[PDB]
């Protein structure tokens, strides 16, 4: 006689797992995270995230963090913005952390919901619609700090070379760096010189993030860099992604989470499309370009599969791309990416996919 049981853990090892954040924009109150095995396309489980959820996995790989909004009666009643902590293996709810009712509601760019390098603090974007950065102390399960210094700035770029430091892109075209103390309160801060012209050459917010620097691409196909090897961030650029032939066909970047960096080689991956003009900056990729950031020259180009967002796994040398519905898995251990497989119907409306962390 068979007996149905619950209490079971995810069937595949953590190192096989990816997280597809499905906005389900057609029914945005039932957003969710779909957990997949990238090696074979198997659906492993899911985490419900209510209205326009955001998601990340703890840097130590043990927990899943979500960020969402509830109301007592969904479309009426008292609002509750929260972070939830879920067990990564059992996919169960553990803890709710109360936020002020101004967490960012918007599409799933990575930089809206991040954590410090040391994993001790969650760092999230608020908009009321005045902007600030919110800090959650994971150990205490508490909202501990509201960084109003970041007013008029947007998104969170963690510095992988410091334990509790991050940057945000500001309306002056520069970067604001925030260094948190061990209590999660601002311990110091600095502002860079202008990196890019906001009016003439706006950048996409998605970083191509190295251990001690970050690169950004612009609406017109230029690249800007922020070097944070020191306490003071040094900024430079532009250099162009484009050669003369590229310019003749009006190639420009397009998408959402549209770039990536392979840290060992310095290769930067960028979604590109031809016939660029005003209004095409979120167009699906016609191609992925592979740029050598040291020589500031393209090394390869491959079909884009209408992808809109991507993410990189450093240790297995992989790139995932995502067209809203389907996830493509690429081997990037060599300069030309190799397509391994496609996971069809991983989501209804996703613009973000992430690997389970393996680096600890």
């Amino acid at each position: 006689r068979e007996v149905l049981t619950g209490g079971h853990s995810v069937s595949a090892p953590q190192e096989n797992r990816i997280y597809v954040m499905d906005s389900v924009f057609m029914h945005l109150t039932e957003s969710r995270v779909h957990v997949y095995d990238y090696t074979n396309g198997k659906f492993l489980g899911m985490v419900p995230t209510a209205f326009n959820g955001h998601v990340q996995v703890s840097n130590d790989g043990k927990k899943i963090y979500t960020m969402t909004t509830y109301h007592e009666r969904i479309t009426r009643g008292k609002r509750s913005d929260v972070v939830e902590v879920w067990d990564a293996d059992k996919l169960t709810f553990e803890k709710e952390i109360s936020l002020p009712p101004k967490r960012v509601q918007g599409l799933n760019y990575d930089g809206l919901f991040r954590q410090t390098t040391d994993g001790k603090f969650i760092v999230l974007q608020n908009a009321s619609p005045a902007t600030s950065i919110g800090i959650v102390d994971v150990a205490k399960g508490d909202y501990v700090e509201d960084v109003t210094a970041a007013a008029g700035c947007w998104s969170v770029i963690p510095q992988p070379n410091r334990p509790r430091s991050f940057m945000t892109i500001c309306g002056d075209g520069g970067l604001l760096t925030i260094n948190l103390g061990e209590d999660g309160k601002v311990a110091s801060q600095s502002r860079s010189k202008q990196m890019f012209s906001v009016k003439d050459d706006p950048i996409f917010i998605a970083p191509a993030l190295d251990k001690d620097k970050a690169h950004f691409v612009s609406y017109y196909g230029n690249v800007y860099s922020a070097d944070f090897s020191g306490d003071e961030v040094k900024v430079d650029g532009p250099w162009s992604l484009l050669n003369d032939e590229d310019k003749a066909k009006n190639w420009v970047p397009g998408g959402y989470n549209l770039v990536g960096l392979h840290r060992a080689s310095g290769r930067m991956y960028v979604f590109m499309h031809p016939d660029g003009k005003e209004g095409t900056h979120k167009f699906p990729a016609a191609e992925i370009w592979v740029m050598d950031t040291k020589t500031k020259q393209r090394v390869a180009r491959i079909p884009g599969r209408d992808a809109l967002s991507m993410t990189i796994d450093q240790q297995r040398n992989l790139m995932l791309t995502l067209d809203g519905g389907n996830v493509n898995v690429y081997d990037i251990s060599q300069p030309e990416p190799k397509l391994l497989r496609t996971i069809e119907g991983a989501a209804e409306a996703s613009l973000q996919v992430q690997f389970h962390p393996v680096g600890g």
């Binding site: 149905l4 079971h8 039932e30 957990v35 419900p48 169960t92």
Partner: protein, 109 residues
């Protein structure tokens, strides 16, 4: 074969097959809870030619799985024969009644 609506044990399933949702025929996906109650089907085993009682326990407390939806109705009857009826949510008595997916648990002959 267990992920197909034509699989013999699934002859009265109305819902998503748990085996497509990170579970199996007899186990809930991680973080969803078995229903203690269920509708029951009598399904024909094409191998031995005998009929078996299958108990269709739901897995509950997570939102719709959305994969492998089946709507098969062999020997299914309306709500005046309530435990033979599959147009109701058999999660209805769980601590959380949100329907995630359905299992097909073999009881016996």
């Amino acid at each position: 074969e267990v992920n197909s609506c034509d699989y013999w044990r699934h002859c009265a399933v109305d819902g998503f097959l748990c085996s497509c949702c990170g579970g199996t025929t007899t186990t809930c996906p991680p973080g969803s809870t078995p229903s203690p109650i269920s509708w029951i089907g009598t399904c024909h085993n094409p191998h031995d030619g005998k009929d078996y009682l299958i108990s269709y326990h739901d897995c509950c407390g997570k939102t719709a799985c959305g994969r492998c939806q089946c709507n098969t109705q062999t020997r299914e009857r309306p709500g005046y024969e309530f435990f033979l009826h599959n147009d109701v949510n058999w999660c209805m008595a769980n601590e959380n009644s949100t329907f995630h997916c359905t299992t097909s648990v073999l009881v016996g002959l």
